[PDB]
Amino acid sequence: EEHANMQLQQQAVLGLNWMQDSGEYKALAYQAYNAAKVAFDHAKVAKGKKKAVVANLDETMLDNSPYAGWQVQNNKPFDGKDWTRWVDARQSRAVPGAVEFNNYVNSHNGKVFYVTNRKDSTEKSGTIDDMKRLGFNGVEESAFYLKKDKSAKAARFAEIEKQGYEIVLYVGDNLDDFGNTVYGKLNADRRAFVDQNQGKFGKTFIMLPNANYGGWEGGLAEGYFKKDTQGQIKARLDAVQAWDGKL
Amino acid sequence: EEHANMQLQQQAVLGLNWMQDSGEYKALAYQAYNAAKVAFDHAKVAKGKKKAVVANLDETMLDNSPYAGWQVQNNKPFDGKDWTRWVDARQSRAVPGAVEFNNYVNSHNGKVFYVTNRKDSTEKSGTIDDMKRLGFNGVEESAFYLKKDKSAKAARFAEIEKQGYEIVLYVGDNLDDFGNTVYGKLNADRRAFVDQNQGKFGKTFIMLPNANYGGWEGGLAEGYFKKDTQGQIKARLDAVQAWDGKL
Ligand SMILES: Nc1ncnc2c1ncn2[C@@H]1O[C@H](COP(=O)(O)O)[C@@H](O)[C@H]1O
Numbered sequence: 001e002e003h004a005n006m007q008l009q010q011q012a013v014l015g016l017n018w019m020q021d022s023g024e025y026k027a028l029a030y031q032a033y034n035a036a037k038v039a040f041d042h043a044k045v046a047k048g049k050k051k052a053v054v055a056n057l058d059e060t061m062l063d064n065s066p067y068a069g070w071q072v073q074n075n076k077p078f079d080g081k082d083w084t085r086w087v088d089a090r091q092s093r094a095v096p097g098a099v100e101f102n103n104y105v106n107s108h109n110g111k112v113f114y115v116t117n118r119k120d121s122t123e124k125s126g127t128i129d130d131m132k133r134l135g136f137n138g139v140e141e142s143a144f145y146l147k148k149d150k151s152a153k154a155a156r157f158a159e160i161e162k163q164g165y166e167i168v169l170y171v172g173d174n175l176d177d178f179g180n181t182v183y184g185k186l187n188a189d190r191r192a193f194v195d196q197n198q199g200k201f202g203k204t205f206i207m208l209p210n211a212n213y214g215g216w217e218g219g220l221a222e223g224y225f226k227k228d229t230q231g232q233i234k235a236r237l238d239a240v241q242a243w244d245g246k247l
Numbered sequence: 248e249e250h251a252n253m254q255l256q257q258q259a260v261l262g263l264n265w266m267q268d269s270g271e272y273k274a275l276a277y278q279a280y281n282a283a284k285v286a287f288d289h290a291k292v293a294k295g296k297k298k299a300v301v302a303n304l305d306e307t308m309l310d311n312s313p314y315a316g317w318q319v320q321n322n323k324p325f326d327g328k329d330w331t332r333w334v335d336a337r338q339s340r341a342v343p344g345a346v347e348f349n350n351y352v353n354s355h356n357g358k359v360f361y362v363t364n365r366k367d368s369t370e371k372s373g374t375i376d377d378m379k380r381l382g383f384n385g386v387e388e389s390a391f392y393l394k395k396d397k398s399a400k401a402a403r404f405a406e407i408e409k410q411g412y413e414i415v416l417y418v419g420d421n422l423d424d425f426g427n428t429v430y431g432k433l434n435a436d437r438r439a440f441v442d443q444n445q446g447k448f449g450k451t452f453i454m455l456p457n458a459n460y461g462g463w464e465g466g467l468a469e470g471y472f473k474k475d476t477q478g479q480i481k482a483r484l485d486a487v488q489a490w491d492g493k494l
């Protein structure tokens with residue numbers, strides 16, 4: 001139903017305004033990348049290891065908000081086929097602070113590896129072109145670990161380590177950017193992971209804000225991503241914790 | 248119109264789910280407070296000065312998300328009269344990491360002052376009771392600079408300084424928590440302020456995420472807060488930056 005599609009996408013509007021328009025969002029991005037530089041500079045690795053930083057792309061280093069805007073204007077739920085066209089459109093922007101941090105790491109005895117669920121086979125060319133255009137250094141193909149057969153990221157982290165790197169910090173907008181332990185899990189388990197790692201945030205796990213999509217959306221209800229539009233609307237509304245209006 | 252009220256408040260749903268349910272939100276809160284502790288510990292003040300930290304309350308140290316949930320469920324635009332009842336309901340929660348940071352500052356030769364637009368005359372009792380209940384130390388009345396005649400906060404910062412304190416850092420969720428220079432201004436000016444202070448974020452200006460309300464909402468359009476519901480809906484939708492769907 002068109003009505004259901006409109007309701008689902010309208011629910012994203014205020015958070016999208018915040019991410020696209022607010023100074024507050026920019027300030028959070030700068031805060032993250034300022035903290036990331038401090039962590040990188042402090043990091044020491046085992047003898048014989050090279051220093052690596054693992055960075056997520058979408059909503060961490062790359063800003064895809066115009067795709068979300070298109071969803072709002074056209075009442076379009078997320079669809080990977082539309083996403084591939086967005087990537088091919090080569091209109092990605094950079095998250096504030098990301099290029100400077102990336103280039104700093106790469107010029108100070110580190111290497112940033114991009115572990116990203118953009119698709120290796122269909123979305124690589126647009127990604128690399130946009131990143132070159134946006135000013136990122138170190139965007140040769142071998143810096144990228146794009147999605148092949150698995151959306152969970154830990155195996156790609158292990159590939160990086162096998163190449164003689166020690167990962168000194170991770171940058172992401174989704175807890176699944178830090179490992180697999182809450183991949184596919186609901187939000188209670190995801191919050192528990194965060195509590196169990198409280199001291200790592202702003203140190204070895206660097207967070208960017210994303211109020212628009214992610215593992216937390218699927219985390220709203222069992223089987224969320226397989227539900228129809230009406231089911232997803234209901235899952236979102238049922239997750240709301242509301243004051244009852246009484247004293 | 249009830250329809251307009253519903254549309255306006257539905258636009259907050261996804262960001263509310265993110266703030267209430269996601270581990271990612273918690274991780275951002277811990278990141279902020281972890282960075283804040285590092286900044287506090289590093290801070291040195293002028294001879295003869297006492298060390299102060301200025302902290303915002305709403306959506307910085309206190310979590311009012313159930314009020315937003317009530318707005319969603321009842322299609323209620325923000326109204327200060329409802330807000331006063333929410334405060335009186337004494338159901339505020341603590342933002343993750345806030346109590347620990349607050350109590351650490353207060354036990355390590357600093358003092359946290361709460362500069363907050365909760366109302367001194369009608370909202371003080373609930374605020375203090377909730378904070379005591381939530382575990383905050385140092386919540387005697389004189390620690391609070393609640394709203395009297397002005398929503399802009401710089402004059403209250405100056406009052407703190409007049410009492411012999413040097414403010415070593417500010418914690419907030421709204422750029423107006425750091426001074427007055429973009430108070431009442433639109434988002435272009437607010438983003439410019441952030442760019443002009445890029446290096447301070449995560450150091451002396453500590454940010455918490457708030458995708459639900461703030462100076463950035465008013466910043467969406469000239470006279471936003473005086474517009475009717477339909478006008479505010481239009482302002483939000485007109486602010487959206489959307490991909491045109493072409494390559
Ligand atoms: N709104 C959305 N909902 C679900 N998946 C999305 C959305 N937007 C983008 N994606 C997908 O998620 C990927 C980003 O994953 P990640 O590398 O974890 O940032 C994108 O490359 C898309 O395949």
Ligand SMILES: Nc1ncnc2c1ncn2[C@@H]1O[C@H](COP(=O)(O)O)[C@@H](O)[C@H]1O
Nearest residue numbers: 303304305325330362363364365421460
């Ligand atoms: N959704 C909202 N829209 C506008 N104002 C709000 C909203 N929620 C709370 N407020 C007001 O803003 C104050 C918080 O301001 P601050 O001290 O900057 O965090 C609250 O005490 C309320 O008076």
Ligand SMILES: [Mg+2]
Nearest residue numbers: 056058059173
């Ligand atoms: Mg991402």
Ligand SMILES: [Mg+2]
Nearest residue numbers: 303305306420
């Ligand atoms: Mg606030």
